[PDB]
Design a protein around this nucleic acid. Structure first.
Lengths: 465, 57
DNA sequence: AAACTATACAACCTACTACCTCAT
RNA sequence: UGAGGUAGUAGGUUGUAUAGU
C-alpha cells in the first residue's frame, strides 16, 4: 500500500553564507550575496508618469507595512534590505508628448500603432543612452494605462509581435540595456478607480508584495545577485529546454526551442536554439534533428567550459514533451564517456487532485508521489507552513515528472527540481508550480520570437524579465 | 435495430482475454498492445457516457 | 502485350501534445 | 495561477487516382 514520500524544503543562500528558506525574509534579515555600489534609475513617459514614479519610489524608500508578516512580510526599505541606495535625484527622464499619442490614436489598425509607438520608445531609449553621460543601469518604461487598454491586439475602437513589452525587449536586445516596463495603474492605484467608484487594481492590503517584487527586480537587473542555490554538485549542469511553439501563420514555426542553463549558481546562460526550417508546422513534434541538437549541446558545453574550466559530470535536461530515440542518440555521442545525460519532462495537463478529509486545508507543498522508477509526481504547490498559507489556489495540482533515458535517482531529480522552483526573480513569490527554467522558458521564447532580425542575443537575463 | 443480424454465426468472432492485456503480457499481429489498451479506454469512456445519459440527467 | 489486384502513400476516426485568456 | 476555451494532430482507420508486368 503506497504512501507519499516527503522531500525537504530546499534552501537558498544569502549574505555572509547564511541559509534560509524564504527569499523575502532572508533578504530582510541578511541581504544579497554580492553588493553593488549603487543604481541610477532612468524613466521614459509623461511628466505625470514621472511624478507617479517619484511618489512610488519615495514610498518604497519608507518602510511600508501590510496586514501581517506571516504571509506577506513588510518592506524594511530598499537600503535596509539590499545595502544599495535608491534616490529621487540623479534620475534621467525623457518625456513623451501626449500630442503624438493623439496623432497615433486615430489610426485604423492598431498593429501599426503598436509598431510606431514601440519603435518610438525604442529609439527614444537608444538616443537617451547614446548621448547622456549619466549611466542608467535600469530604464523604467512607465506606459500609460489607456495605451495598454485601447491598443490591445484585439482592441476595437509579420514577425513583429503585437505585445508591447515583447517587442520592446526584442528590439532592445541588440544593445544590452536592462529595461523593465512598469504599468501605470500598478503604481498609481491610489488615484485609479473603476466606473463604479472602486479601484479594480486594488492594493489596499497587498502593496508590500508589489514593493518587494519591484525592489528585487530592480536589484537583479542592476547586476547584483539576490540569492543563489545552496548545494550544487561538482559537475552537474541543468538544461531547462524551451519547447513552446508560436502560431506564426504560414511562416515556418517548426521548432522555436531555446534553452536555459544553471551550472554553479543562479546564473542563466540562454543560447538561442535554432529556428530550424525543417519539419514545417504540420510536423510539430519537437523532434530535434541531430545537427541542431549537437550544436545546442556544444553551446552548453562551451558555456560550461568558459564558466567552469572543467568538464561536467552529469547533464540535467528539463523539457515538457516526449523525447524520441534519435534525438537522444544525437545527444549521446557528442557528450564524453565520463558524463551522464538524462532527460526530464514536466507537464501540467495530467490531472491529479488530492483532497483532504477534515478541515479546509490543501496538500502541504513538498509531497512526492512515486508511481514507478521512471514516472513520479511532485507537489510543488499547496500549503507551506513557513507561509502559513497555500501558494496554490483552491486545490493544488502537481507536475507529472518522468525520466526518459539514462540512469539516475528519482528522488535526486525530485529534490533538484524542487530547488530549481525557488529561483524566481521577476516575481518575489515563495515558489511557483513550473520550475524557473520552464517559467522563464515561455517568456524568453516570446521575446526571441518577436524579432527574427537578431542573430546573437545576449545570454544574460536582465534584458528579458 | 439490424434485422439482418439474425444469421450471424459466432465462430467468426475472436475473443482475447483481458488479463494478459492489462498485465502487458499480450501482443499479437492483429492488435497492438497499445492499440488494445486504447480500445479499452475508448470502450470505458463510451460506456460511461451512455451510462450517464441513461441516468436522465 | 495483358490477366487480378493489391499498390503508395493518404484523408481522415476518436482523443494526445501544446496554446491563450478570464477573471478569482 | 488555475480551470474553462480552442485549433490541430500522435498513428494507424479506409477513400482519391493510379500502373505493375
Amino acid at each position: 500500500m503506497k504512501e507519499l514520500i516527503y522531500i525537504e524544503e530546499p534552501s537558498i543562500l544569502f549574505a555572509h553564507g547564511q541559509k534560509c528558506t524564504d527569499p523575502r525574509d532572508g533578504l530582510a534579515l541578511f541581504g544579497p550575496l554580492n553588493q553593488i555600489y549603487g543604481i541610477k534609475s532612468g524613466v521614459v513617459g509623461t511628466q505625470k508618469g514621472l511624478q507617479i514614479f517619484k511618489s512610488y519610489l519615495d514610498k518604497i524608500q519608507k518602510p511600508i507595512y501590510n496586514h501581517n508578516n506571516i504571509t506577506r512580510p513588510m518592506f524594511p526599505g530598499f537600503e535596509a534590505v539590499f545595502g544599495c541606495k535608491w534616490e529621487s535625484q540623479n534620475i534621467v527622464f525623457k518625456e513623451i508628448t501626449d500630442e503624438e499619442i493623439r496623432r497615433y490614436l486615430f489610426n485604423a489598425s492598431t498593429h501599426k500603432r503598436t509598431y510606431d509607438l514601440v519603435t518610438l520608445f525604442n529609439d527614444k531609449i537608444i538616443t537617451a543612452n547614446k548621448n547622456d553621460e549619466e549611466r542608467v543601469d535600469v530604464w523604467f518604461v512607465i506606459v500609460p494605462e489607456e495605451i495598454y487598454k485601447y491598443c490591445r491586439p484585439n482592441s476595437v475602437l509579420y514577425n513583429y509581435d503585437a505585445q508591447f513589452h515583447d517587442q520592446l525587449k526584442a528590439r532592445l536586445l541588440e544593445h544590452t540595456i536592462p529595461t523593465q516596463i512598469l504599468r501605470e495603474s500598478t503604481l498609481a492605484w491610489r488615484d485609479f478607480k473603476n466606473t463604479f467608484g472602486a479601484p479594480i487594481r486594488d492594493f489596499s492590503k497587498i502593496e508590500g508584495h508589489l514593493a518587494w517584487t519591484i525592489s528585487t527586480a530592480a536589484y537583479y537587473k542592476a547586476g547584483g545577485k539576490p540569492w543563489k542555490l545552496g548545494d550544487i554538485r561538482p559537475g552537474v549542469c541543468y538544461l531547462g529546454l524551451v519547447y513552446k511553439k508560436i502560431e506564426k501563420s504560414k511562416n515556418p514555426q517548426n521548432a522555436c526551442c531555446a534553452a536555459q542553463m544553471f551550472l554553479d549558481n543562479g546564473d542563466g546562460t540562454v543560447f538561442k536554439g535554432e529556428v530550424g526550417p525543417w519539419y514545417n508546422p504540420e510536423k510539430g513534434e519537437y523532434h530535434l534533428k541531430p545537427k541542431e541538437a549537437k550544436a545546442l549541446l556544444t553551446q552548453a558545453l562551451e558555456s560550461y567550459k568558459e564558466q567552469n574550466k572543467s568538464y561536467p559530470k552529469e547533464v540535467f535536461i528539463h523539457a515538457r514533451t516526449r523525447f524520441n530515440d534519435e534525438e537522444w542518440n544525437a545527444f549521446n555521442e557528442v557528450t564524453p564517456k565520463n558524463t551522464n545525460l538524462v532527460g526530464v519532462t514536466i507537464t501540467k495537463s495530467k490531472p491529479l487532485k488530492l483532497y483532504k478529509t477534515e478541515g479546509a486545508f490543501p496538500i502541504m507543498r513538498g509531497n512526492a508521489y512515486i508511481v514507478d522508477e521512471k514516472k513520479a509526481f511532485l507537489w510543488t504547490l499547496g500549503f507551506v507552513p513557513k507561509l502559513q498559507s497555500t501558494l496554490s489556489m483552491e486545490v493544488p495540482n502537481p507536475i507529472f515528472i518522468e525520466i526518459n533515458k539514462g540512469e539516475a535517482e528519482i528522488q535526486q531529480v525530485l529534490k533538484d527540481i524542487l530547488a530549481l522552483t525557488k529561483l524566481n526573480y521577476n516575481a518575489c513569490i515563495y515558489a511557483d508550480g513550473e520550475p524557473v527554467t520552464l517559467r522563464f522558458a515561455n517568456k524568453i521564447g516570446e521575446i526571441l520570437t518577436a524579432s527574427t532580425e537578431i542573430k546573437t542575443p545576449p545570454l544574460a537575463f536582465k534584458y528579458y524579465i | 435495430q439490424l434485422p439482418k443480424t439474425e444469421t450471424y454465426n459466432g465462430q467468426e468472432s475472436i475473443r482475447i482475454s483481458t488479463s494478459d492485456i492489462l498485465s502487458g503480457r499480450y501482443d499479437t499481429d492483429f492488435i497492438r498492445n497499445y492499440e488494445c489498451q486504447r480500445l479499452i479506454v475508448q470502450l470505458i469512456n463510451k460506456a460511461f457516457e451512455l451510462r450517464m445519459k441513461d441516468k436522465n440527467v
